[PDB]
A paper describes a structure:
To assess the structural role of the [name] domain and the hydrophobic sensor residues, which have been shown to be required for [name] activity, we also determined the crystal structures of [name]-Δ[name] and [name]-[name]/[name] when both are in complex with [name]. Additionally, the entire [name] domain in the structure of [name]-[name]/[name] is also missing in the electron density map. Nevertheless, the structures of the bowl-like body of [name]-Δ[name] and [name]-[name]/[name], including the protease platform, are superimposable with the structure of the resting [name]-S452I/L252Y. The proteolytic active-site residues in [name]-Δ[name] and [name]-[name]/[name] are also in the misaligned resting-state conformation. Our crystallographic results also reveal that [name]-[name]/[name], which does not contain the two ligand-sensing residues, has a flexible [name] domain missing in the electron density map; importantly, the bowl adopts a resting-state structure showing a dislocalized protease platform and deformed active-site loops which are superimposable on the structure of unliganded [name]-S452I/L252Y. Since this mutant contains normal [name] ligand-binding and catalytic residues but has lost completely the ability to degrade MepS or process FtsI, its structure demonstrates that the two hydrophobic residues are important substrate sensors essential for stabilizing the ligand-bound activated conformation of [name]. In contrast, [name]-Δ[name], [name]-L252Y, and [name]-[name]/[name] all failed to process sFtsI. Protein solutions with concentrations ranging from 10 to 20 mg/ml were mixed with equal volumes of reservoir solutions, and for most of the protein samples, crystallization experiments were performed at 22°C; the exception was for the sNlpI–[name]-Δ[name] complex, which was performed at 16°C. For the sNlpI–[name]-[name]/[name] complex, crystals were grown with solutions containing 0.2 M sodium citrate tribasic dihydrate and 10 to 13% polyethylene glycol (PEG) 3350.
[name] (also named [name]) is a member of the family of C-terminal processing proteases (CTPs) which features an embedded regulatory [name] domain inserted into a serine protease domain. In [name], [name] is involved in degrading abnormal proteins that are unfolded or partially folded and marked cotranslationally at the C terminus by an SsrA tag and that are exported to the periplasm through the Sec translocon. By associating with its adaptor protein, [name], [name] is also involved in the regulated proteolysis of MepS, a lipid-anchored hydrolase specific for PG cross-links. The activity of [name] strictly requires the [name] domain, and the [name] deletion completely abolishes the protease activity.
Numbering used by the authors:
A (entry chain D): 25 to 232, 343 to 672
B (entry chain B): 28 to 286
C (entry chain A): 29 to 284
D (entry chain C): 25 to 232, 343 to 675
The structure:
């Protein structure tokens, strides 16, 4: 183990890294969907992003350490083009030293008596904070951080002797981390600073489940539910199987559940769409050069034709969203739930190896990879799914709030935009039904207690997001919040069990580990699906 | 239609006896690895010149499998990826050319063309301006540069083309295509000067390949797709298979056929 | 807006087959019989790509292995025709029919050779026999007409008219005949050509054929400028194995 | 040995001959320079020609034997196209039988007494004679023939016992010939009948020195003579050598001697021409399809530039004629002598073998060859050399007479015709001189005794060609002609010897074997060349 700054090894670029930088820059500047110019404005931003990778919390580096290298911040494009990585390695070695200073100061602080009876607060988001000007200012910031870390552990029932044991372990480990950092970790972080300024799905990479069916029965009526986990190769076949099976059961309507259904295979979105409509295009795919491909299901056998609801949430991403958008745009299915993720783009990997590397530089290692965006998705009506995602016809109460998840929140996400509509024939309309579906939905959820509680949690989450990043360092204030949190949860559970004829819990920890939350959104979608069945029949 | 037309070019007896000879030599095992990759390169150049680009790509890939550090080979594979519309991979190939040999000038032309068709006009202009400075009296260097600059700023492209002509020695025939582009001569005068300069069918065919392509591009940028289409097919009709203008007349037609 | 195709380019299939054929011929996986067969097949492919010298090489090699392939002499005869050595071409076709007197296309090709060789009555003998073997093939009537035009212009036209009237009138080529007969104008011919073409390859083919017969029509009227342009426009289609492509080239050679 | 008709083997077509006929017909009807149609008119002529091959003298076959097969004379084209050769072999076997009849009759007539006192005549040309109607008529014709053969030998000093010994040998040999004739001889003669109807240089074929220079001197004047035997590959190089050597001497003029110079390489005519003229085309060659190739010498260098005479005769053929015509048409040399042969065409051989014959019919023999005309020559002025040949500027006396030899006398020789003149620049003119050269020539040869005798022989030959084919069967009339022939020759020789200071001959057989006739034509051409030399240095502009 390790007791002083000068025993942290000084990290240096490996002989291949200049070349790898040139190759990465070549790919990103020439082939990326986003057509950015690696000019001086862009170089500065790569620079700022690199600093935030070295010091997320703005409590390790000094403003004078930063201004030293910020003079030449606009030159980073050149540096990257010509494989000069001095700025990246110089800052990284300085950051390692500054980090060891912080951890060793933190170890010293731990011995001091802890007092959590203040009205002080801790900011969890320092990403917009001025850089600290000197050691005193760093030291105040780490007094505050160590107090947060201490109090964090106190609120989980640990003793002062045990807080100091844990944090000693943690801070000593963070120091052993510094010595075990290598050249590739530095290079990697420099290419990440470039990558992520282009878009949030672009990256540099250092070198080295089936469909479920159930039937819900409300009154005398029956609804089939297809629980789809992913758009896996083969899905569309397993769904045929299940649809013929529901036919035998004579179901009034069908729900397709694409909640938390992310990524996946685009072919499967196209072919799955095929099962419910017969037309051409499902999706339009645009490359990095204005060229548009239209993808079609050309075996126009419809296997369903009955009332259809698509159930989606904020985590429905990519293939999911294409399928849901097709069904919406064709007027084939009602979409219910939350606005989806808005993942409207596709990335691809590319090796940085060249076939003559081994021959001309036998001493090099293998070289790793880039991932970059190449295609954007558009709907048949012209609009992209990028950002806006799919907006449901009936939005559950959770959807009528701005969320902290989704492409629209990610850093430098590409914008929404549109192209011309494709040629297509709508299979239904369904806008007729919308005002009665919404009136009956709104009637039912005013009286359902799960929904009533969700409304309450939403009102409360909204009055608290004001101060979301500001945490109290007063142990009493924080215990009282933890206890009202546990008591609310307990009451929520007990309200449920009294309704169900199940025994009340005495305390929250007596709850089984395997306890399944109910699914109000799915339950209410069954009701929505049956409403649709009535209105479609006459 | 009394156009200017050549007899479309045919394989010469020499090109065909050399290919026959090349097949026999490759079928022998009399060859160093260096010599074999060199011969595969040479046979690829010949097959490309006859318009057999898949046979060419095959000999080129085989060459790199024997020696992977031939920049001359990557240059052709980059060209082919350009004609195939795979601009992304074409950029990779040209980068490879210039990594092996940064003095390999024609990679700047070809990467320029690739970046032009790939809708990266500023980057294309960088490569084509560098290709220009390496031989400013070669008019075709000014022409490709102009094609790229036209997308940034039409008025300023034209001004830079005018300057490139005024600086030049005005000797090479291609300056007449430039003169047309600049408004200084009419289409008929261009064609008159083309026939005057051509001496035999091969030189006529070549002049027509070049000239119909630039005429084609001129009309395309005016929105006249019927005239552009005809002109591109007339360029290709000359069978000057290894001209860049032949290759991109084909590509331009492929993009008119898709639309 | 005249009527032009994109000049035809080698297809990927034709080029991978050639590459495959080279490997097989280099290998020792072939009988003598199999080798002569493959050399024939590679000749046919190279001819279809317009590599006639490489074709002749593979054809000569085939005959060296087996000297009784009528299919090979037929191509050698064609090549001797394009080279203007009519005399030797006759020998090659005689050889075709001596090996296999039912090898009909030798009658066409010997007829064409005799036509270019200025033996119009003898050409007519071969081409009339080629006609009788498939009278609804309009191109058979067209080559017969070309030979008879040199004997008697007015009677050639009459026999062509009869050949049309007796035919089923199905195949597109009858439209070139209709033009030859005066029944339609050049613009109508072109109109029907575009209507009948479905894609670039069929357009190119139609233009190869049609520009050659238009070329010949104008040449026989003395319009060398129009003939010259038309022959070059036929050739521009790169339909290398059409007889009409081969003799558009030969006609151009004679105008030089 | 052989005593009766039925021991003559009946000849039959071999298994390959049908094929060979098809192949021959294919070449001749498709590729010959002459574009004939093998129709019924042509078939009849092939038939007539075949009869004359079987019976040249029209004294073997009967008119009834001929009419038997003449009904189907127009079918011979079909027969040839499809390899049916029944008419050819039937007539050939009938001809063999009829021939044996004639020879056996001749053996019998021979023993009868000979009387050569009759004033009867014998016609040597029966080629347009009516076919004999019967055996009596045949027998009278062979009485006549055997009398000719007998008298022929008597006039060489043989006795009656020796004439009968010889003619017995000869007629018995002609019978042994018949039995030794084979199928290929028949086939061959049938294809010859086809061939030679097309033109006289076309044929079916069954399967199987340097230039010399001297110098002549008249007064103090000198003339160099290049005696060219043939247009051999290499000639043009050997002639440079000789022209440098003549320069080292100082000759007033040069004679090129192309007498009896036939055939040869065309390239050599072109390149030889080059030595005397600057540039341009020498000859235009036309193929079987109206296409015209122009052959030129493209060296540029003239190696002579001085007065030049080309000496030619009736036997100057083909390459020779091209060279002389070029020199004439360019105004470069004076041509002297006789109108040339008129060989204006080129022939080529082709094998009738095919590469698959050995494999598919292993038991066949090898198959032989055809020769046919493919090209005709034209001069730079447009006219062909075919037939008219080259007409000299000064014609020696034997040239102002129609001769028996030359293309214009050959059977079915293609006609003369012309094409457009080629583009060329005349290097001189020489037309002015023509009437003074001729006046001086005519003065000199009125006084030369060789020339005086040539004109005498021409007058006598010309008054004799009336009955040229009609020979007398009177021994005394024929001895008297042989004796006036020998006496004229003896006097000729003795006139020469008296002039030369040489001893007179007493009789003609005392003359040495190695005796060289003089060369008056060459001597007089030396005089012509010197005349040219004066008139050329006397020219101001």
């Amino acid at each position: 183990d390790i007791t002083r700054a000068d025993q942290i090894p000084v990290l240096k670029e490996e002989t291949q890294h200049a070349t790898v930088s040139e190759r990465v820059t070549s790919r990103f500047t020439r082939s990326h969907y986003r057509q950015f110019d690696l000019d001086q404005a862009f170089s500065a931003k790569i620079f700022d992003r690199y600093l935030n990778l070295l010091d997320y919390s703005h409590n390790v580096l000094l403003a004078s350490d930063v201004e030293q290298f910020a003079k030449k911040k606009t030159e980073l494009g050149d540096e990257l083009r010509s494989g000069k990585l001095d700025v990246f390695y110089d800052l990284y070695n300085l950051a390692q030293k500054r980090r060891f200073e912080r951890y060793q100061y933190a170890l010293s602080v731990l011995e001091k008596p802890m007092d959590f009876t203040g009205n002080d607060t801790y900011n969890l988001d320092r990403s917009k904070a001025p850089w600290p000007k000197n050691e005193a200012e760093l030291n105040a910031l780490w007094d505050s951080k160590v107090k947060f870390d201490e109090l964090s552990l106190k609120l989980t029932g640990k003793t002062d002797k045990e807080i100091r044991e844990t944090l000693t372990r943690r801070y000593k480990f963070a120091i052993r981390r510094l010595a075990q950092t290598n050249s590739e970790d530095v290079f990697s972080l420099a290419m990440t600073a470039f990558a992520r300024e282009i878009d949030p799905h672009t990256n540099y990479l250092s070198p080295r489940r089936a469909v479920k069916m159930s039937v819900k029965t409300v009154g005398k009526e029956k609804v089939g539910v297809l629980d789809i986990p992913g758009f896996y190769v083969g899905l569309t076949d397993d769904v045929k199987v299940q649809l013929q099976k529901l036919e035998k059961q004579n179901v009034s309507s069908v729900i397709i559940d694409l909640r938390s259904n992310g990524g996946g295979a685009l072919t499967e979105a196209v072919s799955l769409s095929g099962l419910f409509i017969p037309a051409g295009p499902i999706v339009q795919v645009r490359d990095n050069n204005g060229k548009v491909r239209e993808d079609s299901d050309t075996d126009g056998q419809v296997f369903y034709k009955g009332p259809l609801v698509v159930l989606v949430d904020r985590f429905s991403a990519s293939a999911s969203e294409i399928f849901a958008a097709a069904m919406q745009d064709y007027g084939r299915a009602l979409v219910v739930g939350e606005p989806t993720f808005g993942k409207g783009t596709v990335q691809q990997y590319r090796s940085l190896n060249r076939i003559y590397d081994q021959m001309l530089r036998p001493e090099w290692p293998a070289l790793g990879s880039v991932q970059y965006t190449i295609q954007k998705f558009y709907r048949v009506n012209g609009g992209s799914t990028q950002r806006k995602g799919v907006t449901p016809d009936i939005i559950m109460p959770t959807g009528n709030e701005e969320t902290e998840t989704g492409e629209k929140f990610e850093d430098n996400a590409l914008p929404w935009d549109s192209i011309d509509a494709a040629t297509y024939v709508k299979s239904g309309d369904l806008t007729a039904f919308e005002p009665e579906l919404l009136k009956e939905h709104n009637a039912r959820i005013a009286k359902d207690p799960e929904f009533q509680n969700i409304m309450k949690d939403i009102a409360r989450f909204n009055a608290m997001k004001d101060k979301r990043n500001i945490v109290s360092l007063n142990y009493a204030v924080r215990e009282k919040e933890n206890n009202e949190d546990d008591a609310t949860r307990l009451a929520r559970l007990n309200e449920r069990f009294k309704r169900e004829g199940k025994p009340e819990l005495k305390k929250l920890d007596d709850l089984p580990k395997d306890y399944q939350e109910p699914d109000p959104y799915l339950d209410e979608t069954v009701n929505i699906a049956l409403d649709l069945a009535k209105l479609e029949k006459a | 239609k009394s156009e200017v037309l050549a007899v479309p070019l045919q394989p010469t007896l020499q090109q065909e006896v050399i290919l026959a000879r090349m097949e026999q030599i490759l079928a022998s095992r009399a060859l160093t690895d260096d010599e074999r990759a060199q011969l595969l390169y040479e046979r690829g150049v010949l097959y490309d010149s006859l318009g057999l680009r898949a046979l060419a790509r095959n000999d080129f890939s085989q060459a790199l499998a024997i020696r992977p550090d031939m920049p001359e080979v990557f240059n052709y594979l980059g060209i082919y990826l350009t004609q195939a519309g795979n601009f992304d991979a074409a950029y990779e190939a040209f980068d490879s050319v210039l990594e092996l040999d940064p003095t390999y000038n024609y990679a700047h032309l070809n990467r320029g063309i690739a970046l032009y068709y790939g809708g990266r006009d500023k980057l294309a202009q960088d490569d084509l301006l560098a290709f220009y400075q390496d031989d400013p009296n070669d008019p075709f260097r000014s022409l490709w540069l102009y094609l790229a600059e036209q997308k940034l700023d039409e008025k300023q492209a034209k001004e830079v083309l005018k300057q490139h002509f005024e600086k030049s020695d005005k000797e090479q025939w291609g300056w007449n295509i430039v003169e047309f582009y600049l408004g200084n001569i009419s289409e008929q005068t261009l064609m008159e000067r083309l026939k005057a300069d051509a001496t035999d069918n091969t030189s006529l065919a070549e002049h027509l390949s070049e000239t119909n392509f630039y005429l084609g591009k001129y009309y395309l940028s005016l929105g006249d797709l019927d005239s552009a289409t005809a002109l591109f097919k007339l360029a290709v009709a000359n069978n000057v298979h290894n001209f860049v203008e032949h290759r991109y007349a084909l590509l331009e037609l492929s993009l008119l056929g898709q639309d």
